[PDB]
Amino acid sequence: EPWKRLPPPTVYPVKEARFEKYIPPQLDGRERALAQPPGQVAIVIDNGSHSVRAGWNFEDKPRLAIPPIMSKYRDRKMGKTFSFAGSDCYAARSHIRNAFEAGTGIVSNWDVMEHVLDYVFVKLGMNEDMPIVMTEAVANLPYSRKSMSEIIFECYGAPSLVYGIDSLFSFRHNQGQTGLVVSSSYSATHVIPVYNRKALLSQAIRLNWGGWHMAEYMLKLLKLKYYTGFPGKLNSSQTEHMVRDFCYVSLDYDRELAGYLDWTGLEDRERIVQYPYTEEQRDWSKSLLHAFRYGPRPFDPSSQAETHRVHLNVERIRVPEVLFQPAAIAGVDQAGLVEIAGDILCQRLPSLPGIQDAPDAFLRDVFLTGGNTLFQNFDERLRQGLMALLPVGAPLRVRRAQDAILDAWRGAAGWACTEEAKAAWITREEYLEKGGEYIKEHDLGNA
Amino acid sequence: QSAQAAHQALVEQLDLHSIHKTFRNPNWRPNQRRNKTIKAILGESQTNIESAPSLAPMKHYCDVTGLPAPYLDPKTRLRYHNKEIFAMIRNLPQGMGEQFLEARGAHTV
C-alpha cells in the first residue's frame, strides 16, 4: 500500500512571536545625532501596525522594531506595577493591549501608543528636542492625526513633526518617478497611482485585506479543519508564521486547486507543523476528509506525536488567494486586487484630464510594497492578471521593492531632512496656531 | 530557585515603569475618553471612502475543504464538493454549521 512505501514525514516545529533578548538604550545613537550638521537630524518612525520601526535619518536601517503593544499589570506577589511596551512584552502574563484597532491601519488605543513612544525614545537613548518624521495611514482620520500630534507636541515637546505614507516613501526610495504603487501590508492593501512623484490619492483604493486578515482567516480554517478538537492551543500568532513560511500565491488557482487533495503527490503538497506534545473495502484510504486532515498516511489517536500536528493542504494556496478573490473565498465583498488595479488603469487614469500618457506611463512601473506582497509568484500572478486587461503589447512591468519591509522606513529617512521635507515640517508654534488637524500637503503625504 | 530569581531579574531589567521618563511633560494629562473607536470617529463627522465593491461573477468553493463546489445544500446553506462532504455537513454538531458560514462571514444568527 502506498503509505507503507512513502518515507517518514518531515515536520516543522510551530513558531510564534516570542521574546529573545533585552536591548539597552543605544547611547551611541544620541552621540551621533549631536555630531551631525544642524537641521540634518530627525527621528524617523515607521509606525507600522505590525512593527513600529524607529531610528535616525542619518542611518541606513532602524535601530528598533517592536510590536505596537503594551502590557501593564500589578504583580500581586510583589506589590509593584510592571509595564512593558514592545517585545519585552513577551509577544509572561500577556495583559496585552494593542495601539491599533484590529484589522485597521488606524491608531485608537492612545495609551498603548504613548507607552510605545516612551519605549522608542528610551531605547533611542534620549534623556533630557529632535524633529520627528512619522508615517501615517493612507487617508488617516483627522481625529487620529490630532491625537498623535497632541502627544508628540504636548507630552514630548518635539520641535517639528511631519506625516508621510509608508507606501510612498518606499516608492521614492526605489527611484519611483511615475507608476502604480501596490501596497499589501499587515493592516490593509492599497493601490495608489503616482504621477510625477505626486500621489493621486483621490484615485487610490483600499481593499481591507492584509497580513492580519490572513492570519485570522488561517486560524478560522484550522479551527474548522480540526473542529473535533485540536489538543494544542491555536493562536493567530502561530498562523501568522504559517502564512509566512508555507503559503504562496497560485499561478492558476482553479487548475491547481481541483487536484490539490489528489492522493498521488499529496505527500509533498501537504506541510506539517507539530505542536509541542507532552510525551507519555471502503475505508480511510479512499476517503477525501482523511487526505484533507491527515494526508497520505494512516492516522491513530494513540500517538501523541501524530495528534498535536496540523496539515495545511489547501490553505497553502487558499489563504493568499483572498486578495484576488475576496468575495468568493472570504465574503469580503470587495473587488479583487487585479480588478482594482485594472479599474484604475483602464477607467480612471485615462479619464482624469490632467494626466498625460495614461495608462502607458503607469504600466511601465507597477510597484509592489509591504510585507504581505512577499508571497512567491505574487508578482507573476499580478502581471498575468493585468496583462489580460491591458491592450495588447502594452509595456506592463511589475517590480518588487528591495527589502519590501524596511525600505519604507529607508525612504522616510532619506527624505526626512530634504528641503521638500523641511518645507513640509510643522513646528510646535504652527501646531499651537493651527491645531493637530492641520498638515502641510506634500508629495508623500495625505491631503 | 535561581531560575525563578533570574526570571525576576529579567522581568525587572525589562520593566519600563521603574524608569522616570525625563522627556515627558508632567503637567500634560490626556482626556481619558480619547480612545474612541473608528466607528465613533467616523460617526462624529456628521478619506475612508477608498473601499471598492465588485460586480464580477463569483466562483463557488467548498465550505469544508475549499475545493470547488458544484453543489449548495438547501438545508445548511453550506457549499460542498462531493457527497462525502455532504455526509459530513449534515452530521455536524448543533452549532458547527454556523461556524462554517462565519468563515465566509455569512451569518443567520
Ligand SMILES: Nc1ncnc2c1ncn2[C@@H]1O[C@H](COP(=O)(O)OP(=O)(O)OP(=O)(O)O)[C@@H](O)[C@H]1O
Ligand atoms: N516573507 C514574508 N512573506 C509573507 N508575508 C510576510 C513576510 N514577512 C512578513 N510578512 C507579513 O507581512 C506583514 C508585514 O507588513 P509590513 O511590516 O510591511 O506592514 P506595517 O508597516 O507593519 O503595517 P501597516 O502599514 O499595514 O500599518 C505581516 O503580516 C507579516 O506577517
Ligand SMILES: [Mg+2]
Ligand atoms: Mg506599513
